Design a protein around this ligand. Structure first.
Ligand code: PAO
Ligand code: PAO
Ligand code: PAO
Lengths: 321, 321, 321
């Protein structure tokens, strides 16, 4: 049915609901076998990963590095200051050299087009470790965390309040494929990419889900089962701090926000979190799934790597989505 | 009897003589099995370590990284420039995320209070990789090196000449627990922390050992079995170079220093060494145990990790202390 | 016959034709067993490597790191910004500490004399990862790539056009030992080291091969089976960009260069490549072996490490040289 071996993972728009559910099934299987049963599964023995990071990272870095190694493989952390990329060398040449020396690449970049060049020029899987446009592997952790909390995903309403950034784009490329509704509030002038919105409208129509884009936080939060935010100033945007602090006033998630949400509301944030987007009462609430979510970055990137590099079949019963 | 699994190791003041002897016993066992018998002991297979370094390191870095990996685990080297800590993220949040992704953390920091926050907020063992206040794992290497040289430790006199810094504080938190005497000379105004001195007086009283603090190098060296020094300008103190070079004149360890020491005198230095604290004749003397000492940083951090993360029992006969 | 265990590899002038052929035989054996047969060969299990890099690297870094780990060992990446070297610590002391903590060192340096100090002061193998004077492990990859292309090496003419740098010096220390001829063109004032040239004349005489040094690109290319170039501005020489761009005009390798070469001509470049030394038509030609060559950096550094640290014997039939 689902065949993911050898594929790239640059964005969730290139994946069906069934393929993304397969990745969450494998995540749950690997988490059960290793975290709960204590098995050692050397599924990536004799394999290596090239990790290119052009931006800082705590969770993507740790989850990917300890995750690849936990399956018996060798992760190699490469930064801008150590390798030749950009300066003495082109991306086409870097891509061909990585192909012959590693079995896959995870790259945290600025330009999504750099991930496209890497996928075209390399003959090994390229995984997006976050770009300015999309962050697909974050949403894998998010939807596994919500399936574990609610015991299913179909019919949940996701309520985004914040910037029209990479995280919202990845939710837009995937929520309807799971039968989930999306209500998203951004400041005026900080909307999601018109092309992404257009494709999210199509997915909503195909799956019979709702998509609401607004500038009002309480309209996005109304009836939502999950409240979701992120920093107002993403990496590479620090020059705009002053303008963004002014434009985003009134967009902090608080218990006033939650009062309008469904009674079973929970909260997500990809982290790192700052005091601006959400207050401490919601961030550290018993309803906040932020640290479960962060943990699931590890079991989901392990599943991505196993599905793109092996023919391993999940032993676990498929979770209810 | 001794149970160390799950504990943090932030300072040796939180450890009894019997617990620290257990760590040196395990070090000796692991050194004998792997270095001498050539066994491969995958005791930390399926485990990972988060290594946070806010300061430079050659020995703590190499001993910890090659040591964790030699036992089958995966070490992950994280610096200030790569992870979000300090800048985009709090230590509480970093601590909770590390907990769900690694099995332990070793952190070389400035503030000991940062290690306290990490231990309180993480549910996994936190090991001090050096702070401004204490460096417990250095003293583990030091006392293993002296037990190997002398075939026991009880009744030795340690003679510190130098700054009232982290290394002297760690010796003060541990020497009396082994029945060792301490005679320490620092410049006036560069004494050890009054709280540490107070607690070292109490340990000396409980164990019936002597504690002498002086400003005279030859008084500290008199009758000492081990001469010990370190840099006059510790990491983070480079602004004070001029004032310290002036204040520490006359505190260089030389053969004049050694003439006053016991006939079986040896020499220790945690490294890196500069020409100021000790001359070449003592540093490279046959009595200098500096490079044995540096090697034992590896077998002792391996023992720390095995004792805090497993239920492994030493097969070796307990060494005489 | 050949015994390489415990030796350093600082330059190919310290190696006979038979010893270098042994290293290419082991490379071919390891490539066949692991890449083609898919075997997992944990030959360096329980071993570690200290990797000191004072300059940037993509290929030496990846090939060495994934290569050491593919054989079951642990590679440790150490940079100038993380370890004490240069600043708080001497190379003699760093060398002795590395000896007791790792099983070998690979170091990419500026001064070849730093590699000499490391080899004298350490009791473990020191491998040159590139210095200003020599880059021996590059030529191992190059000659394996040419043996795979041509099915033998004896009698080939290597045609260097470019700077009288580390790569040309390493070709000069080795081509005649394989019965290969060398014709090399550099700009006036940018010749190879007079001592290296002198020793290359002696090797040419002992092996009955030709050695031609010229300032004319087409004289170096005439009748050559392999065209070889590299950057005009090596790492550490960026201050000389203006003077070198002017002095090296007319030294770009093009199809005009190739028109003069033997009919079976191929092309090599150690990478990273810039547009100055060679054009796109030659670089991306079907005759360009640049990306095969880059891959073989991995199988040859694996063979170096296995031959200096173990008693493993190649199972493969010896390749024809
Ligand atoms: N919009 C934010 C998203 C950060 C995602 N965070 C993570 O993936 C967690 P990490 O940075 O610790 O790996 C930005 O682009 O800056
Ligand atoms: N008082 C000194 C102690 C240095 C300890 N050295 C070590 O642990 C050896 P390393 O720095 O190579 O890891 C200071 O605080 O600067
Ligand atoms: N003459 C050049 C040689 C570069 C060698 N390149 C390599 O070894 C490939 P890498 O730098 O990606 O490891 C110089 O000294 O700059």
């Amino acid at each position: 049915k689902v065949q993911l071996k050898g594929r790239d993972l640059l964005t969730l728009k290139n994946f069906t609901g069934e393929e993304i559910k397969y990745m969450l099934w494998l995540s749950a299987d690997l988490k059960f076998r290793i975290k709960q049963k204590g098995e050692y599964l050397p599924l990536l023995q004799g394999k290596s990963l090239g990790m290119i990071f052009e931006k800082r990272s705590t969770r993507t870095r740790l989850s990917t590095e300890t995750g690849f190694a936990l399956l018996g493989g060798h992760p190699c952390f490469l930064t801008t200051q150590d390798i030749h990329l950009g300066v003495n060398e082109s991306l086409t040449d870097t891509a061909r050299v990585l192909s012959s020396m590693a079995d896959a690449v995870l790259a945290r970049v600025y330009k999504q087009s750099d991930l496209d060049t890497l996928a075209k020029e390399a003959s090994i899987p390229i995984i997006n470790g976050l770009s300015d446009l999309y962050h697909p592997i974050q949403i894998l952790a998010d939807y596994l965390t919500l399936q574990e909390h609610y015991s299913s995903l179909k019919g949940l309403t996701l309520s985004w309040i914040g910037d029209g950034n990479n995280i919202l784009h990845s939710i837009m490329m995937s929520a309807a494929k799971f039968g989930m509704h999306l209500q998203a509030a951004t400041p005026k002038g900080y909307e999601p990419d018109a092309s992404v919105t257009k494709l999210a409208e199509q997915y909503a129509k195909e799956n019979g889900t709702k998509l609401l884009l607004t500038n009002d936080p309480l309209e996005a939060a109304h009836g939502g089962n999950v409240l979701i935010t992120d920093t107002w100033i993403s990496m590479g945007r620090e020059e705009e701090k002053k303008k963004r602090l002014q434009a985003f006033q009134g967009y902090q998630v608080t218990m006033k926000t939650a009062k309008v949400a469904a009674s079973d509301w929970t909260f997500l944030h990809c982290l790192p979190r700052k005091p601006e987007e959400v207050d401490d009462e919601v961030f550290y609430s018993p309803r906040s799934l932020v640290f479960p979510e962060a943990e699931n970055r590890k079991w989901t990137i392990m599943a991505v790597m196993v599905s793109l590099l092996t023919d391993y079949s999940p032993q676990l019963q498929k979770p209810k989505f």
